[PDB]
């Protein structure tokens, strides 16, 4: 939601197979093409929902 | 979560373009059960009682 | 906090049906090998 | 006593192993986490 309340999607942070997910990107990103190299760190790329666009644009 | 939020703002259940494809998924699995049951009913005798009936079809 | 015998119920609910269905496959491969007499009996 | 005129061979193909494993492993993906809660 871009409200700085992060949502835990992965298994290693206490999720099931059913409750776990790969989240979508941040609302603050919007439509912006957000690759790895346009983050300042992969810490930040993974905070804002970077790996959604990596999986979706390569799924499609 | 994606389906419920898209029910609220959007009302997909009252959308006939959604009604048409649930008639394509009901009728899809309707006819798959039909065409599967009309073929496997009318099968010609090759096997015995003690063998799977799938061995009455050799490949090719 | 996670429930307790679920570590048992999953892993014995996988492996005991998984290892069972392996052996109906191992049975035939030996039975079809015993049928056609080769180097194996 | 005596040998039966009943007893027979029991078979399972290679594909039927793969169906049968993937049945058990995928039901174990489903009904795992419900057992864990």
């Amino acid at each position: 939601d871009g409200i700085r309340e992060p949502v835990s999607g992965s298994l290693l942070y206490g999720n099931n197979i059913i409750s776990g997910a790969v989240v979508p990107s941040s609302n603050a990103i919007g439509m912006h093409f957000y690759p790895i190299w346009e983050a300042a760190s992969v810490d930040e790329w993974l905070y804002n929902g970077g790996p959604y666009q990596l999986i979706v644009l390569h799924f499609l | 979560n994606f389906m419920l939020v898209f029910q609220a703002e959007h009302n997909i259940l009252m959308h006939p373009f959604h009604m048409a494809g649930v008639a394509g998924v009901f009728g899809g699995s309707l006819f798959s059960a039909m065409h599967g049951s009309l073929v496997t009913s009318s099968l010609i005798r090759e096997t015995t009682e003690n063998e799977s009936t799938n061995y009455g079809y050799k490949f090719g | 906090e996670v429930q307790f015998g679920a570590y048992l119920a999953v892993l014995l609910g996988t492996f005991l049906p998984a290892l069972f269905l392996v052996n109906l496959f191992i049975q035939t491969e030996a039975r079809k090998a015993g049928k056609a007499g080769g180097q194996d009996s | 006593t005596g040998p039966n005129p009943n007893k027979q061979a029991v078979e399972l193909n290679r594909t039927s192993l793969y169906w049968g494993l993937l049945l058990i492993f995928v039901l174990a993906v489903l009904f795992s986490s419900y057992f864990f809660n």
């Binding site: 197979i17 | 090719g60 | 996988t14 | 793969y18 494993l21 993906v29």
Partner: peptide, 30 residues
């Protein structure tokens, strides 16, 4: 410790699919 059980089963299905594609019983015309 159940994330072990989750990743064992998910990789478990991924193994079974790998054997099911590449080590399948081939059909023959004969």
């Amino acid at each position: 410790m159940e994330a072990l059980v989750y990743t064992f089963l998910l990789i478990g299905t991924l193994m079974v699919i790998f054997f099911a594609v590449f080590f399948r019983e081939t059909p023959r015309i004969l």
